[PDB]
Amino acid sequence: SFSGYLKLTDNVYIKNADIVEEAKKVKPTVVVNAANVYLKHGGGVAGALNKATNNAMQVESDDYIATNGPLKVGGSCVLSGHNLAKHCLHVVGPNVNKGEDIQLLKSAYENFNQHEVLLAPLLSAGIFGADPIHSLRVCVDTVRTNVYLAVFDKNLYDKLVSSFL
């Protein structure tokens, strides 16, 4: 199972790790992708997860969008986890760099409650432009299932732990 995590709460754990490397090692039931509404996995966590699947995630995602249309900001869909996990839960947090309502971050984290355990990044952090400290706070106050957070950046990981209330 998951190793080397710092326990933040009853159900939230955190580790300074590359979520792709973590997924390949653990092969969890669910890996969360920091998706956009189009499932265009170009950069950030999505680009990295998709590259690890040799673009199979993007091919599957394009078929999903062709059939269903875009996701909602705050929404999700369950697709294959390919070589990384059993399933990938593609969750769309608000992209502050596109003026999306930060209040939608709680709705985005609510998707995690449909899965007993998940490996995940901090939603709306990184290239999505939100404050990762705020994202961690919303995560802790919203997710009730077991969430193992992988934070790529060591400096941010240290800041998140040292400022955690």
Residue 136, both tokens: 């961690």
Q: Are 5 and 13 in contact (CB under 8 A)?
A: yes
Rounded Cα gap, residues 157 and 133, in angstroms: 10
Q: Is the dihedral of CA 100, 104, 106, 111 positive or negative?
A: negative
Rounded Cα gap, residues 149 and 133, in angstroms: 13
Q: By three-state DSSP, how is residue 41 classified?
A: coil
Residue 153, both tokens: 């950046």
The structure was resolved to a resolution in Å of 1.0
Rounded Cα gap, residues 22 and 37, in angstroms: 25
Contacts of 136 (CB under 8 A, 6+ apart): 8, 14, 122, 149, 160, 164
Q: How many domains does the chain have?
A: 1
Q: By three-state DSSP, how is residue 126 classified?
A: helix
Identify the domain containing residue 50 by its residue range: 1-165
Q: Are 28 and 57 in contact (CB under 8 A)?
A: no
Q: How were these coordinates obtained?
A: X-ray
Q: Are 37 and 65 in contact (CB under 8 A)?
A: no
CA 10 to chain centre: 19
Rounded Cα gap, residues 11 and 116, in angstroms: 10
Q: List the beta bridge partners of residue 158.
A: none
- DSSP character string of 54-86: TTHHHHHHHHHHHHH-PPPTT-EEEEE-TTT-S
Q: Are 17 and 119 in contact (CB under 8 A)?
A: no
